[PDB]
Amino acid sequence: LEVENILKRYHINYTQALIDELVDWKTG
Amino acid sequence: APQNLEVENILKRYHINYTQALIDELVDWKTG
Amino acid sequence: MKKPMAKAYEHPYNSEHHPLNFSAVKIAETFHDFIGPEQVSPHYESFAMSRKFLLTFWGGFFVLNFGMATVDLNWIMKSTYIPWIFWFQLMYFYVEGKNSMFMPLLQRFYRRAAANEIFTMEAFYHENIENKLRNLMRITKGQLEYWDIHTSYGEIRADSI
Amino acid sequence: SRIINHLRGDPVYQDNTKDVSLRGTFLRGKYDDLPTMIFFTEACDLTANWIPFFTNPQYDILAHRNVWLLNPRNFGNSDRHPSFDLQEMSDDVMRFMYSQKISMATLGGHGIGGKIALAVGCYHAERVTGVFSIDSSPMDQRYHEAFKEFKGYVNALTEINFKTWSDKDVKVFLKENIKDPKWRSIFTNNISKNAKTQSDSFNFEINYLNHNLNFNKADSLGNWAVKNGIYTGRAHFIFPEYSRWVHLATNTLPMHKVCARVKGFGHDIFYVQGDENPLNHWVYDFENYANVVASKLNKFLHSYDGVHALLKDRTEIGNFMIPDRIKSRNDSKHIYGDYSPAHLHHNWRFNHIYEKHDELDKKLN
Amino acid sequence: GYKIRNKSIFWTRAGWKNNWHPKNFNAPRPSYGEFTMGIRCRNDHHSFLRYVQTYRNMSRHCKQYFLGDKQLEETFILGLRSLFLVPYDSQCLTDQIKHGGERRFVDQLDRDFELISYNTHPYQLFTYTVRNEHLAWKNEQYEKIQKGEKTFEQELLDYLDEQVLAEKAKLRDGQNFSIERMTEIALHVFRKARAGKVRPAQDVRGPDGNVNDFLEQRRPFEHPNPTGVTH
Amino acid sequence: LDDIENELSFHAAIWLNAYADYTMFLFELEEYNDPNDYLMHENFDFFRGLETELEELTETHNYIPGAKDDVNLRGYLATQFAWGKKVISFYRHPADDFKCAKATKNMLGR
Amino acid sequence: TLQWGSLAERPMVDRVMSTSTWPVPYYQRLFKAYPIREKKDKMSLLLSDIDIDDTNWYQAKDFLRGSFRGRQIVDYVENNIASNTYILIQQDVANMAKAYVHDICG
Ligand SMILES: CCCCCCCCCCCCCCCCCC(=O)OC[C@H](COP(=O)([O-])OCC(O)COP(=O)([O-])OC[C@@H](COC(=O)CCCCCCCCCCCCCCCCC)OC(=O)CCCCCCCCCCCCCCCCC)OC(=O)CCCCCCCCCCCCCCCCC
Ligand SMILES: CCCCCCCCCCCCCCCCCC(=O)OC[C@H](COP(=O)([O-])OCC(O)COP(=O)([O-])OC[C@@H](COC(=O)CCCCCCCCCCCCCCCCC)OC(=O)CCCCCCCCCCCCCCCCC)OC(=O)CCCCCCCCCCCCCCCCC
Ligand SMILES: CCCCCCCCCCCCCCCCCC(=O)OC[C@H](COP(=O)([O-])OCC[N+](C)(C)C)OC(=O)CCCCCCCCCCCCCCCCC
């Protein structure tokens, strides 16, 4: 949930779809 | 530099306000 | 439980209100009984600032009271001129002149600086004494390690057989 | 990458209080040579939470100075030592400034970090240009309800044994004991796993901190001792209108008591207009509080920080003459008159800018 | 905490931490027999036996008022030795004292025994008070045990024994019950018991920063006139 | 075996008694705070026994401050900048006088 | 600062509150009131950092003799232990290890 934590720090409203695209971007 | 464009385009589609600090942290998060 | 002694020796000439021996502690107790407890004000403002106009009236009333009573006040002003000039010119250097002239005479400052440092040492008393105990507790814990080894010998001797 | 540079190190337990090195994040400014700012986060708070504040284009703080988001001892990444003396922690910063080749720096702090920043100005005033304290005051806070809660949370955090407890046991313990949402989130992020998945542990030294808070004596981080003295330089204080840490009724008086150059409310001491909310202590989370703090911070760094005491602003540098005391100069044939005080380059000790500009001056003449 | 920062704190004109032979102008100088006509000196070699007799006098004259309390006599002996062992263990070099340290301590102890012979020494009056307060508490326990009642000290001991069983019955992962854990169990019970008693306020400040005295009553004013006695 | 069983048992009781001393002191110290905020006679009551030793100094006329203290730390703080820097000698009584006098073949007893 | 106000309002600047209450009572407490010279149940704070000494073993015997097992320990130590002091200090495992090799042979 590192991607969720950095987004939370910046106070940016994040959707669940955005988190998956970012996780896939790192893993892929 | 190329990884900056990958994240920026992802943040572009969600019309989310992004800063260079966030991208640098996300890019550092990818390499880390 | 064995029955202890009924009482120790009771001195016939020593009491709490009239202690036989002397120290500043008993004098300090009777001193604070005299001046009483600290007169804590429960108010939101101090008494002087709330009654400045009133205290100014009574301040000038007693000045006028002394002024109206003293019919020879000019004789007292003239009689005070010589000692006022004499004592101020004589003690100027020892009180104020030393701060910018020949000698500083810092004896009284040294007494303030030492007391100001003691004020801090008393404020940090709990800290300094706790660090000294951390070393003694370390020594005590080191000696208690030998009993922990002995209490396992019975288990070691049983499991070895 | 480039703007965000945090040096990686491992905390080392030190027996000597002088062999303590501080670690933190460095934020590079927009321009080549700018003075540096050293900022201390709240006790047991992440330095990364302030990165979006100091890297916000709207605030544009990096346009003024380079920022070091530095952790104090026993916190985060820095070395651990059981002592929390403000003088010993202040000497840590001076060794950090030396190892980093910093001649003098601006000091900032949030909460208890504000006390630490102001303490460095008290013990090393010649190395500090100014102090900007956010929601703090040099006063004994051992009996403030906000500090008691923080003190109570640290005590409860000593119950957890990372070896025996599972991850689900820790999550339940924190939700039930730590009722404050922000303190809960901060303490979770301080939990980290060591290399080779040995075990989990808090980033801050929980044992050394608990003894400091639980003892509740002069060396506690909530206390401000008379031993710290007086800060002689520029100081600015900002705190919320309804803050659980700084009460506007009386908690401003310590600022005049410790800081010699503080003029008073409306000049060096401001309150952010806001509502009653126990989370208003964390000004960087709310844009309303953050906008006012950033503007006041930019005003401090731009016009008031590192300016001589008897000058009003930076605008008077070079055009306002300060009176001189007689018999204060070594030259005997000196006509005493007013002078403009010398302001030096921010890192003149470790660069040769004065030698280089001397030679360029001779080419003119 | 706080440490003395002055490195020269213990420097004297005679050396570091010198409180045995301070430096003064009239320093001791030798005497030569062939050139000395007469001399007036009060020094002698009698301090050793005077030191022995003084210990016997102080011990025996204090035991007159102990009423045969054997434990008090043995406790007093340990205290009396701590008074006579001062020159043997002190940091001060008692053998290098200005004009004879042995004579100085013997004359100092004789002033103590003079007060002891009159039963007016503060160490004596302190001993009688401490022993009376101790025996009064021991007699309270004895009366409660003869009545089959359980003493307050036994209630805590029994309460602390069942706390260790409860903690060691739930702590099965580890089986090392340290003295640190044993201590914080008792202290948690001691604080709760001390807070339960109606004791006078010892700490300056309560939970708030305010003092815990009877004088710490500020506004708002909500108390009426004091009422009189009832019939 | 019973020799060390009882030897180590008594050895542990000695250092358990010392552990309880330091533990109980830190327990009573929790109620004592800011010695600067207590009155004079109340601070002596927390440190029971100091008033007794103070009476011993008075009744024996040992009214030279710090004479019987092995390290008169208060005496060093008071003389940090004194002329002829010195502290009182150990156990110096204000009444004792060890002055001597001799007559030699020369004048002034030289 | 050195400019705190008028002389009449001097006692005003001393109070510092730990709560947000208004108006604030100005008076700053100097000392703790001590109306009754009561003998405190608390033990003396002089017993702070004294090293090990004779009082430790003397009090250990007094508390051990309160038990049946402790009475056996004290009697055996004071009679059948070749030591020149009651202040027992363990600085080696010589007496411990030699007591185990003389016992485990069975
Ligand atoms: C028939 C008709 C006649 C009968 C009518 C009957 C009615 C008579 C009216 C009497 C009123 C009684 C009710 C009030 C009594 C106290 C008055 C007062 O000011 O108390 C507040 C004041 C502070 O109260 P607070 O606001 O709660 O602040 C608490 C903090 O502790 C504060 O400490 P802080 O340091 O933090 O703050 C500052 C502090 C700063 O103040 C101080 O801390 C000390 C000030 C100096 C004290 C006096 C030094 C005198 C040294 C002795 C030498 C003269 C002795 C006189 C007698 C000698 C023989 C003749 O005080 C202040 O707040 C501002 C100063 C207010 C003025 C007080 C000083 C005025 C002089 C009073 C002395 C009067 C006698 C000498 C006058 C000349 C001879 C007639 O307390 C004092 O100053 C105590 C001083 C001693 C009090 C008794 C003195 C005698 C009675 C005083 C009457 C004053 C007016 C008349 C004389 C004026 C001549 C110029
Ligand atoms: C044995 C002492 C001397 C005896 C001579 C008589 C006294 C001198 C007369 C003039 C007075 C000015 C000298 C300064 C005196 C300051 C002493 C002082 O006030 O205590 C401060 C002192 C601590 O305060 P401090 O701030 O640290 O003092 C340092 C100063 O502030 C400043 O710190 P500093 O480190 O710079 O001070 C060092 C001190 C060092 O002093 C010395 O070492 C003395 C020099 C060696 C002795 C030379 C005489 C040789 C004697 C043997 C030969 C005689 C033969 C005669 C025939 C044979 C007879 C059989 O002063 C000097 O350097 C003296 C040099 C003179 C400067 C000359 C500059 C040129 C002037 C050109 C214009 C001329 C205009 C003249 C108009 C009139 C003047 C206003 O308190 C103590 O030490 C207490 C212990 C007492 C010390 C021994 C007694 C000395 C007298 C003390 C005052 C009375 C004590 C009893 C009352 C106590 C309260 C109840
Ligand atoms: C205030 C009201 C009450 C007043 C009561 C009196 C208060 C007096 C306060 C104490 C001051 C006493 C001064 C004693 C000398 C201290 C200085 C010193 O020791 O000299 C060291 C001096 C100075 O050495 P130093 O190293 O300590 O200082 C060096 C000075 N500087 C730093 C500047 C380099 O060395 C000497 O040995 C000189 C000895 C000279 C002796 C001068 C004093 C002689 C008189 C003393 C005896 C008087 C007895 C009178 C009794 C009367 C009975 C009827």
UniProtKB/TrEMBL annotation, chain B:
This is Uncharacterized protein. It comes from Tetrahymena thermophila (strain SB210). The chain holds residues 75 to 106 of 108 of the full protein.
Automatic annotation (TrEMBL), chain D:
Keywords: Hydrolase. GO terms for molecular function: carboxylic ester hydrolase activity. Residues 60-298 form the AB hydrolase-1 domain. The keyword Hydrolase applies. It comes from the Eukaryota. Belongs to the AB hydrolase superfamily. This is Alpha/beta hydrolase. The chain holds residues 94 to 458 of 460 of the full protein.
TrEMBL record, chain F:
It is found in: Mitochondrion inner membrane. Belongs to the ATPase d subunit family. This is Uncharacterized protein. The lineage of its organism: Eukaryota, Sar, Alveolata, Ciliophora, Intramacronucleata.
From TrEMBL, chain G:
It comes from the Eukaryota. This is Uncharacterized protein. The lineage of its organism: Eukaryota, Sar, Alveolata, Ciliophora, Intramacronucleata.
